[PDB]
Design a binder for these strands. Structure first.
Length: 983
RNA sequence: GCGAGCGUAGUUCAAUGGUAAAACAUCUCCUUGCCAAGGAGAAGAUACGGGUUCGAUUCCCGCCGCUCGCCCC
């Protein structure tokens, strides 16, 4: 038969009542979610056992949609299970319950996808997954780590069943009202009374006069009750205080600045209320309980650390951190290995080392004792150092010999190495090599050991005997588990040599790169059935590979009516949420009504497709509804209602930013030198620039921001010279993306970057090396890339002042210099990325930092010129005079003259300087620089050898100093010769 | 508050249970006199305290200050 709603509860309660949980009633006050119940938030704190499963309604006014959208409701029923402490069968009891509910496990793709839950409202976080069943997200699984502010001890396991969608996906209905509550009655005919009127109340009839005066009253009452050591009512009032904030948010009378205040007040109250329950319960003595705590031949060596599911971006790191650090320890312990190779899978990190000997290399080593002079006197017995050395290393005195090195030659002795049996070494060393792995995030399950996910078994084998060592309370043995619910639930490996053959007997494709050649070899074969090809982005396949133990591709179909949507919406929906493979025809290369998904294991073919297409054709209904509602009005009207998006608390929303950009675009369009004839269209592009951010299709599809504006503009009936400008206001979006290539778009891009930098530097928000409050480095790197990779002249210090003029607040002259220095420092980092020597760019950029393109075309050429074998000659000559200038500055008062000039050497040098100064101007490049400076070198030697520039007469000294300074000042405007390596 | 990483000439850097190395800068001098260019020498140091050992820049502990997460925000 078909499962009904009122007996799924009866099957989910009588099951958890047999494991040992104590079922209780629902909440009392309107809870905004399934966690804020006092039976879970206040009871996980403190060392007492707690096993509870219950069912509760959840009310969220923010998700009210008049009860028409088949996905979002204002009242959904959840099932909560809390286990503490975790008994080790955490994710096996869940599968047993799922089987007992009525659905089979052997014919449904049940997989875990990593998802980290975190809620700043009450201060909690943890690590866990969401359970996918044929593409439906039906269950949340989470190991807690922290509640309020206390650290959990011991950690707890939370299993949340979203019960309204399980039956909606199991029965086969498409709407939500079509769910049947019982045999005879339905869900949509008795639970819409508390839906429609509640939606109407939460949307446009909730009187806001009383809510904003009940919120503070409840906060004050909660504080007063908490001050009297009354925990339960104090926390009870917090729930009805936090409900008022949500109902205020639903109406829309909360600004973007009071949100932080409300969140801070609520979290402070929750933090100061949570740490009172622990202090209250400790005085009662914890009535519930308390928690505590002969030579052979080289044979193979296998190490496997069987854990639970790991994120797709941690297997790659761990399988390298293990093998790289393991191929080093055996070298430290003078072991002899063969071919070492590591394998990774979402449930294990194996390393196989072949031909590992059973013994160590017993060889003698020569030590290095004290100096011979110190340890041996001129006459008599050797001093105390020699005897100390002998008694330390247990060697005879005659064994000492003298070898000549350094000043004091040496004292040397020969000692053994104490060869062990090559098994005790591994026994004593493995607990360090295993624990040496580190991850960006970690957790604990039953001890104080840090790891990405819980470890469930360890299989460390060498030849025929087992290496005995215990890690995290697990003893290493000779058993390994394969596919769950399969016939080979757990198998025994008799010898480490016959290991990789056993796993492929269980169907597991352990090799990391082998799975790619079986995914992409079948996905292409399945395409030719309809005459097409797949789309395989690297960032998609790299993550699809590390989610499957034994891949199996299946194709599926959907209706053609969804082809009217934009091409970049279907691809985004397919590839960013469900991780499918789109299909494109070879001829007329648009989208096709097909998709390819990857199952996991041995599953029924028909059921997975029939249950997966019903999700793919359920997402597109929402997408099409949003698109149709979003194309009712043209793009012009959306520019007014963007004020709900804040830019900065001190600067404001996006409307002010757009007005500033459209005001200051004219000057920037003139600094870049773009012709006047194109100035009108630019002034119109900013009229609609960055207006897609308030649209409906972009509210939830963040990645589509920037292109949907172009699509709307094209549909509106505007010229093609403005849609490209609208689209290219966000490029580049990520590293490696394309750059703007149309002239009107460059102006908008650089104007936006400059305004965003100036505004955020006006409030003083300089990021550090680690934190990125706004990613200003990314913006600067985009700006310099746009300026350089497009060959456009610019003046940074002149444009920045103009940009800062229209800022709402006055900004001092130090911020512009700080921004210029920051951009210069980023330009240096960019220029040292293509192999340019650091000392060359470091010298060019201290003088050519104004126009980035000029600097990029000068520093890429001066390095190439520096290999002419004459570069050091010019470097030595030009600034040989410079080191004389520093010191006395009396000669700077006057300049040269032809009255007190001395013998013809200085006159010839001055004539040569006058000749060469004509070709050197600040607007010259370096092509003719050295070719013109070569003629000045010859008189310089004669001058410095035959003028005696020593200051004997004040007038001649001043004149000579001035002449020398003006000779040495020529490169002022081209490059500097201080950071020069030749110097 | 709570973890890690650290600390050697003025700067940059070598090594290991044992008489502390090298560049650069400074200085003293030899070339025809002042800078460049060839040579010789000089001085220059283990953040600080204790413990054990014949003997620790090295092993253990205390403190000083720096840098990074977390706390706060």
């Amino acid at each position: 038969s078909v499962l009904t709603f009122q007996q799924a509860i009866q099957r989910l309660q009588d099951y958890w009542a047999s494991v040992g949980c104590a079922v209780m009633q629902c909440s009392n006050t309107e809870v905004g979610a399934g966690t804020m119940n006092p039976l879970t938030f206040l009871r996980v704190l403190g060392p007492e056992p707690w096993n509870v499963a219950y069912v509760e309604p959840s009310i969220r006014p923010d998700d009210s949609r008049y009860g028409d959208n088949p996905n979002r409701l204002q009242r959904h029923t959840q099932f909560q299970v809390i286990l503490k402490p975790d008994p080790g069968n955490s994710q096996d009891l869940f599968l047993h319950s799922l089987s007992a509910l009525g659905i089979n496990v052997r014919e449904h793709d049940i997989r875990f996808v990593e998802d980290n839950w975190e809620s700043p409202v009450l201060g909690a976080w943890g690590l866990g997954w969401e359970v996918w069943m044929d593409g439906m997200e039906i269950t949340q699984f989470t190991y807690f780590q922290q509640s309020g502010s206390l650290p959990l001890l011991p950690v707890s396991v939370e299993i949340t069943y979203g019960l309204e969608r399980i039956l909606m996906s199991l029965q086969g209905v498409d709407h939500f009202k079509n769910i049947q509550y019982t045999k005879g009655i339905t869900y949509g005919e008795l639970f819409l009374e508390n839906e429609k009127e509640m939606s109407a109340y939460y949307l446009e009839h909730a009187n806001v006069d009383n809510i904003q005066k009940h919120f503070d009253d409840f906060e004050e009452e909660a504080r007063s009750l908490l001050s009297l050591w009354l925990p339960i009512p104090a926390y009870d009032h917090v729930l009805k205080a936090s409900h008022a904030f949500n109902i205020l948010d639903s109406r829309g009378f909360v600004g973007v600045t009071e949100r932080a205040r409300y969140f801070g007040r609520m979290r402070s109250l929750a933090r100061q209320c949570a740490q009172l329950w622990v202090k209250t319960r400790e005085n009662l003595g914890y009535p519930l309980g308390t928690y505590q705590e002969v030579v052979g031949q080289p044979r193979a060596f296998v190490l496997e650390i069987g854990t639970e599911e790991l994120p797709p971006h941690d297997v790659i790191e761990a399988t390298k951190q293990l093998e790289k650090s393991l191929i080093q320890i055996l070298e430290k312990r003078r072991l002899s290995h063969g071919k070492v190779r590591s394998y990774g899978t979402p449930r294990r990190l194996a390393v196989v080392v072949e031909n590992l000997n059973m013994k160590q290399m017993e060889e003698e080593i020569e030590l290095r004792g004290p100096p011979v002079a110190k340890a041996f006197d001129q006459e008599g017995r050797p001093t105390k150092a020699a005897e100390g050395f002998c008694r330390k290393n247990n060697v005879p005195i005659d064994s000492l010999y003298r070898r000549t090195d350094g000043k004091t030659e040496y004292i040397y002795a020969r000692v053994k190495e104490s060869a062990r049996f090559a098994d005790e070494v591994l026994t004593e060393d493995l607990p360090t090599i295993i624990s040496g792995i580190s991850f960006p995030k970690s957790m604990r399950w039953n001890s104080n050991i840090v790891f990405s996910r819980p470890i469930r078994w360890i299989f460390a084998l060498h030849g025929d005997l087992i290496v005995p060592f215990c890690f995290a309370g697990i003893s290493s043995g000779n058993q390994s588990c394969g596919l769950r619910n399969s016939s080979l639930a757990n198998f025994k490996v008799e010898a480490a040599e016959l290991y990789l053959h056993t796993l492929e007997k269980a169907g597991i494709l352990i090799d990391m790169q082998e799975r790619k050649q079986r995914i992409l070899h079948d996905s292409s074969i399945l395409a030719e059935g309809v005459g097409g090809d797949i789309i395989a982005p690297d960032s998609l396949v790299q993550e699809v590979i590390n989610l499957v133990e034994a891949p199996m591709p299946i194709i599926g179909r959907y209706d053609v009516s969804f082809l009217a949507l934009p091409k970049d919406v279907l691809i985004t929906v397919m590839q960013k949420h469900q991780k499918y493979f789109p299909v494109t025809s070879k001829t007329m290369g648009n989208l096709l009504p097909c998709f390819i998904t990857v199952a996991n294991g041995a599953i029924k073919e028909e059921v997975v497709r029939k249950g997966n297409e019903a999700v793919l054709r359920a997402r597109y209904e929402d997408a099409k509804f949003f698109y149709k509602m979003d194309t009712q009005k043209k793009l012009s009207e959306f520019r007014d209602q963007l004020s709900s998006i804040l830019f900065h608390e001190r600067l404001g929303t996006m409307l002010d930013k757009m007005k500033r950009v459209e005001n200051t675009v004219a000057e920037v369009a003139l600094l870049l030198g773009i012709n006047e004839k194109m100035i009108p269209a630019i002034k119109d592009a900013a009229a609609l620039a960055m207006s897609d951010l308030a649209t409906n299709i972009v509210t939830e599809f963040t990645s589509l921001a920037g292109i949907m504006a172009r699509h709307y503009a094209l549909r509106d009936g505007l010229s093609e010279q403005i849609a490209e400008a609208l689209f290219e206001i966000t490029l580049p979006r990520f590293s490696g993306d394309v750059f703007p290539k149309t002239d009107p778009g460059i102006v908008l891009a650089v104007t936006d970057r400059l305004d965003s930098l100036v505004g955020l530097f006006g409030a003083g928000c300089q990021p550090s090396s680690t934190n990125d409050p706004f990613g200003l480095r990314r913006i600067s790197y985009g700006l310099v890339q746009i300026l350089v990779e497009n060959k456009k002249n610019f003046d940074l210090t002149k444009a920045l002042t103009l940009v800062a003029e229209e800022q709402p607040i006055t900004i001092d002259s130090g911020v512009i210099d700080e921004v210029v220095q920051f951009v210069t420092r980023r330009l240096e980092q960019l220029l040292v990325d293509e192999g340019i020597n650091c000392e060359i760019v470091r010298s060019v950029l201290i003088e050519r930092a104004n126009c980035p393109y000029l600097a990029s075309q000068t520093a890429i050429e001066m390095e190439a010129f520096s290999r002419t074998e004459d570069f050091p000659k010019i470097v030595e000559a030009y600034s040989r005079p410079t080191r004389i200038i520093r010191g006395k500055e009396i000669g700077s008062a006057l300049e040269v003259d032809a009255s007190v000039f001395e013998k013809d050497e200085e006159r010839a040098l001055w004539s040569a300087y006058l000749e060469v100064a004509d070709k050197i101007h600040p607007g010259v490049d370096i092509k003719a620089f050295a070719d013109a400076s070569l003629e000045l070198l010859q008189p310089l030697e004669d001058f410095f050898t035959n003028v005696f520039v020593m200051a004997e007469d004040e007038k001649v000294r001043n004149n000579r100093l001035a002449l020398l300074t003006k000779v040495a000042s020529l490169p002022k405007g081209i490059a500097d010769l201080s950071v020069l390596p030749g110097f």
